[model samples]
Target: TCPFYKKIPGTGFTVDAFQYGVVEGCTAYFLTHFHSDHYAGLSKHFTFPVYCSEITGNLLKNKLHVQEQYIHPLPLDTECIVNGVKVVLLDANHCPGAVMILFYLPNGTVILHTGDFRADPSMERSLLADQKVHMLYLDTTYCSPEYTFPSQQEVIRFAINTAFEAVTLNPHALVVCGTYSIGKEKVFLAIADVLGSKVGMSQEKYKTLQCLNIPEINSLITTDMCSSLVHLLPMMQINFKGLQSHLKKCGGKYNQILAFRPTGWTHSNKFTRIADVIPQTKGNISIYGIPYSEHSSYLEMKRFVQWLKPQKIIPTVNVGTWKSRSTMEKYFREWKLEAGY
Candidate 1:
C-alpha cells in the first residue's frame, strides 16, 4: 500500500506488499524486513507464500502468528528458484533480519532491491562486486548531501563512552536511550558489556531480543529500573514530554537522566562536521542525538552506485514528489562527475 512495493516487469513477483489485496494473482511475495512500513498489510491470515530471511520468518510466525507452511525462510547468499526466477538474499545490515533481494529474471536481467540498508563494506565486496546489476531499486532515505554521518560502529562507541562518562560523573543518573524496536541493539549491548551491567527494556523489546537468541543481550534484559543503570526505551518515547514524565517519576530514585538518540538527522548540515559528541539540554535533561543510521549517506550511496554501475536507478521513496526521477538522475550524474567515477 506504499511506495516501497514494486512488481517485476514480466515475472509475476511482488516485493514487500501483502495487505493491499491487490497482488492476489501474483506468483509470490517477498518481505525484506519486519519494519512496519515494509511489512504493511501482512498478518496471521495472510495465505500467500512469503519468502524472507530466517529471522524475519521467525518474527512473522511468532510475532504475527502466521502459519509456518506459508512462510519460507531463505538462506543468505544462496540462489533459489521461485516461479522460474532465480532469487538470492543478501544481508541488508539494517536490522536484525533485513535482506536485499536480487532477482535474475527470465530475460537475463538482474534487478537488485536494496531493502533499506547502508552501504556496508561487506555488501560491496561480497554481493555486488564484478556483478552486472541491470536495474537498482535504491534506499534513498538520505539521498541529499546534508545527511552525512559516521559509521554505525563509530557512533556506538561514541554513545557508550559518552553514556559511561555521564553515569560515572553522576552515579545516581540513569542512562536512557532511544532506539527502534529491532534496530540499535548494538548500542545498548555495548553499554551493558562495557559497564558489566544489564539493560532494562519494555516487554515488547525484551521478547524480540529473546527471540534473536543472543546470549549477551538476553542476559542484559531487565524490568526493574533499579536493576540496572542503563535503560532502553522506544525511540518515540525520547521526546521532551515523555522524558519529562519518566524523569519526574524517577525523581527520588535517580538524581539525573541522560538521554541519547541515535539517528542520521542529528547532523543534517551541508558541510560535514566530525565531532565525537554533541549534547543539548532539553527541559533540563541532557540529551544527545548520535549520528547513527542504517541508511547510506549521500557519499556512501555515490560509492555504492559507482561500484554497481546499474543501468538505471530508481529511488524507493517520495515517488509522488515533483520531478523526483529527474532530480535523482541529476543528483547521481553530478556526484558521478565530481567523484570522477
Candidate 2:
C-alpha cells in the first residue's frame, strides 16, 4: 500500500516517497551527504544502498559513529549504480566528509543534488560548470547577506597564529586545544605546522584519516607519543572541573596551562583557579579563544543559490523556525513549506 509516484509538472519523470519509503520501480535513491539534515532519516529506515565518497563513509563510521550496515562507501569521482540508477559521487568541499550527487536516468535526464557546498572551486571543479545540470538541488543555509565566517585557509592561519601567541606567552605551559574529531583535522595540522613537528595521532584517527586518503600532513604525534614533545599534552579537556583536577594530578611539574576553545568561556569559577581549587598546585591559568567553524557563509550560500537557480530553493540548516523565516525570505523567493520539507 504505497502511493504511486507523481510526475513533476514540467519534468517528464516523477519522484515519490523521499521521506517514508522508496517506490518499487524507482531507479535509485542517492544520499547527497552524511550530514544529519540529509542522512538522519536513513538510520532505522531506508535500507537501500547508499553512495558516498570514501572519506564520507569513514567519517560516518568513525566520526559520526554510524553502523557499518548503513553505508556503501565509494572513492571520490567514482561512478556506481544502485538499485538501477547511475550515480557519480563528486567532491562537494563543504566539510571533511561532504559530497555531491549526480544522477543519470534512462529518459536522458541528468540531475545534481548539492548536499552542502561552498565556493572553493579548487577543491571540486566538476560540479561548478552549468552545462551538465538539468535539475539542481542546492543547500542555501546562508543565502542571506548577514551570515559569514573566515575562509578555511584563513581560519587555518588564524589557528596557527593563535597557537603561536599562546605558546609564546607561556613557553612552559601544557596547551590543549579543542576540535571535532574529523572536521577539525585541518586545525590540528595548522597547529603542527606552527609547532614544526609531527603531533601524535591515536590509532583510530590514523585509520580514519588514512581511509579518506588525506595526506599525513605535518609531523603528528598522538598522546601515546610523548617523548617527542618534552611534555605530554591532551588535545581536548571536556569539563572545566575535571581539567583542574588533571592539572593537580600532574603535581605542578607542568606549572603553566594554556588551553584553546572555540566556545567562548564566558564564566570563571573554582575550575579556573586550579591551584587553590586543587589543594596543592602552582601554575598560571590562561584560556585562549579560537573562533573557527566549518560552514558556508551567507554570501557563499547566496552565490550557490544564484548559480543553481533551482525552480525551488530550500534552506536546510537554519530554517524551520518562524523567528528565522522572515530573515530567510530576504535571500530568495520564500517557498515557506519548500524551505523546511
Give candidates' CA RMSD values in order.
2.4, 8.0
- The Cα RMSD of model 2 versus the native structure comes to 8.0
Clashes (backbone N, CA, C under 3 Å), per candidate, total 1, 10
For model 2, how does the per-residue alpha-carbon lDDT over 40-99 read when each residue is reduced to its tens digit? 445434455555666666666665555778677776666676555666767776667677
- In candidate 1, clashing pairs total 1
Could you say which candidate leads in lDDT? 1
TM-score of 2: 0.69
Backbone clash pairs for candidate 2 read 198-219, 198-220, 198-221, 199-219, 199-220, 199-221, 200-220, 200-221, 200-222, 201-222
- Give candidate 2 regions above 4 Å deviation: 1-47, 59-71, 105-109, 121-124, 130-134, 200-210, 217-219, 228-242, 249-253, 263-283, 323-326, 334-341
lDDT of each: 0.79, 0.54
Q: Which lDDT tens digits does candidate 1 get at residues 252-334?
A: 77867788887666534445454546677864678787776778888888888887777777788756677766677789788
What would the TM-scores of all predictions be? 0.91, 0.69
List the pairs of residues colliding in candidate 1. Answer: 19-41
